Amino acid sequence: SGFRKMAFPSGKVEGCMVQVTCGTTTLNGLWLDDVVYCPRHVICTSEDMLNPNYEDLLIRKSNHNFLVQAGNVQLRVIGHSMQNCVLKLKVDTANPKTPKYKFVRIQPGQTFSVLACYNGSPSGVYQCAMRPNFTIKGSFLNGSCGSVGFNIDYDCVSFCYMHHMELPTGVHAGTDLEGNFYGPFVDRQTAQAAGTDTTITVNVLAWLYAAVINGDRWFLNRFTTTLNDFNLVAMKYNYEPLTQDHVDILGPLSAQTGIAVLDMCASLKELLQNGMNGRTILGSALLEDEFTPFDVVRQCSG
Amino acid sequence: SGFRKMAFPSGKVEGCMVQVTCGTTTLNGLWLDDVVYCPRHVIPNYEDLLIRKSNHNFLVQAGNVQLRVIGHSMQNCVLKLKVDTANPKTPKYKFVRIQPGQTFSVLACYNGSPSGVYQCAMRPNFTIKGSFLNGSCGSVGFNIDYDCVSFCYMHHMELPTGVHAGTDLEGNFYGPFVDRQTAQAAGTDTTITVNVLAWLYAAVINGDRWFLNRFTTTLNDFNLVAMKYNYEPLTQDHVDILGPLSAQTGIAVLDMCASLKELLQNGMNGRTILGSALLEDEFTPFDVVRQCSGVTF
Numbered sequence A: 001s002g003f004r005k006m007a008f009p010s011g012k013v014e015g016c017m018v019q020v021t022c023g024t025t026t027l028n029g030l031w032l033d034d035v036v037y038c039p040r041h042v043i044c045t046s047e048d049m050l051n052p053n054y055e056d057l058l059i060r061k062s063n064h065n066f067l068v069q070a071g072n073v074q075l076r077v078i079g080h081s082m083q084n085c086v087l088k089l090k091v092d093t094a095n096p097k098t099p100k101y102k103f104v105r106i107q108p109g110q111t112f113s114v115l116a117c118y119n120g121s122p123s124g125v126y127q128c129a130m131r132p133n134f135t136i137k138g139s140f141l142n143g144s145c146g147s148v149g150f151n152i153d154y155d156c157v158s159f160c161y162m163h164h165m166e167l168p169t170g171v172h173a174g175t176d177l178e179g180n181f182y183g184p185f186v187d188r189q190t191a192q193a194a195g196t197d198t199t200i201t202v203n204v205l206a207w208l209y210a211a212v213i214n215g216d217r218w219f220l221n222r223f224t225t226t227l228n229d230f231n232l233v234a235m236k237y238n239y240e241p242l243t244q245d246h247v248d249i250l251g252p253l254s255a256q257t258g259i260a261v262l263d264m265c266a267s268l269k270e271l272l273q274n275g276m277n278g279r280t281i282l283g284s285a286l287l288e289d290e291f292t293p294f295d296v297v298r299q300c301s302g
Numbered sequence B: 001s002g003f004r005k006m007a008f009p010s011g012k013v014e015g016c017m018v019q020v021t022c023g024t025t026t027l028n029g030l031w032l033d034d035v036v037y038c039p040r041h042v043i044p045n046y047e048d049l050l051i052r053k054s055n056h057n058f059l060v061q062a063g064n065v066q067l068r069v070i071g072h073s074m075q076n077c078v079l080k081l082k083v084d085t086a087n088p089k090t091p092k093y094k095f096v097r098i099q100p101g102q103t104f105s106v107l108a109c110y111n112g113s114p115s116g117v118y119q120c121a122m123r124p125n126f127t128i129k130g131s132f133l134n135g136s137c138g139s140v141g142f143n144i145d146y147d148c149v150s151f152c153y154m155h156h157m158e159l160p161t162g163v164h165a166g167t168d169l170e171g172n173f174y175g176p177f178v179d180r181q182t183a184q185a186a187g188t189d190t191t192i193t194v195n196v197l198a199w200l201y202a203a204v205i206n207g208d209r210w211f212l213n214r215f216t217t218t219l220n221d222f223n224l225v226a227m228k229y230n231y232e233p234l235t236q237d238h239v240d241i242l243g244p245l246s247a248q249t250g251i252a253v254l255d256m257c258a259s260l261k262e263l264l265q266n267g268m269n270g271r272t273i274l275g276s277a278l279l280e281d282e283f284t285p286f287d288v289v290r291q292c293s294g295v296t297f
Ligand SMILES: O=C(Nc1cnccc1C1CC1)[C@@H]1CCNc2cc(Cl)c(Cl)cc21
Pocket: A041, A049, A140, A141, A142, A143, A144, A145, A164, A165, A166, A172, A186, A187, A188, A189, A190, B001
């Protein structure tokens, strides 16, 4: 029993964190085999951030301009290339702590663990989700750039996020490990703003099924709904549309609890209308949307 | 910006998790130097049950390597299995006993394999609101101080309300619990007041000020309100501990107490603080300072 926001054990990722210094800028890098991945904005000045020509700034750099530090050991940069918004620094030593890994691009609603780092030193690990507006509600301070998001399935680390910047509302934007930003964001200090955020409906439903699995049924009702009527109501509460794919994804949880997806959808509709009336669901007074159907199955069953 | 429930990086602890099998029971063990620590319920008269077991009855597995047990002894509710091999991944460590209200990270394990890490608080009723399934026994709670891991908890059991009970690494249970199959219930829980205040300071640091007011209160008047809402009494030590956060934000500790008192009597009124509709009590003043300053390990 119990339901917590749980992160993956960070050990496999800790052994990959290095410090990358270029001029006055110091941030984090991810050392996998003989490559160090980091945000390309490490080559920028604060005077360059508005309209940086990264290709122009990078061509003026040599290997010895990039100082890479793995613990108390300075790694030697022997090559450098840019792939989208990530800088790839070829180093003369392969990381002996390199785990089995993959670079995966995630979709909004997906969750991952973040190993927050400063100066190539890990300071904390937390769980979060890619918001529908492609931002993440993280906890980052200056120097956290290059901190990574990941999932660990079996013994393989799937890297899905690299932190690049904080938007004016305090939310964060970053890229996949191939340098492609999530969302309409650019690594420029130009006025950008996160789009209106929405609630991850399939995740709230997954979390309601987790609550049923842990013995909480107070919110269930005798009603059902069509998928369309649910979407018409839920869009009025800034909830993401629920697709037939989401209904299918919820199938195992529906089978385990005996509550049809559209029946759980009617309970959600009622919860949005009534609120909780001083009650909680899994220790929360708000509808939690940062647990996927996969996270619920993993934590509540194995 | 941002405020998350954040755990310590678990790497130093992951390199210590082993699987311990005794008969039909399999649980987790903590391998430090040449000793494996695990709950003594893996084997009730525990002296009588232990005397009947030999070293080869305990199967200890570190990854795909079987460790050989060369000795065994019991210290309170923890079993100490002397093994032939010292853990090369042994970090700098200490065994510390924590007080209620203190927080720690839990590395949840099944079959000696870490599956997740989460941040917990030792409740005033000595239980933890953890997330554990069968096989999680022997999972450990820890804090990191620079490069030193301070082990503070070992999981032993789940109480009927779904909350968890365990010991420090010397086998002393937190709370009035015993490691036997009998009727055990967690006492009435209370809210960790100093932690709620620390979390209100974290909210101010992140730009949430709606709950602030011009008022202040005495420590006695606040403690009369704290008792009414099942909140732990706030001591002068708690006020002192909150000093740095009071200096940083410009809001005196008793000034924040009047904010808390008004939140307890009036509620949030449809509003949230740090994305929460409830007053959060599982961040200590130190956790707030560490997360709102970026300390590394
Ligand atoms: O955002 C940034 N850092 C950061 C990350 N996460 C959290 C807080 C921070 C610092 C605000 C405290 C950095 C530096 C500041 N400006 C900036 C601008 C651009 Cl275009 C890019 Cl790509 C990176 C940055």
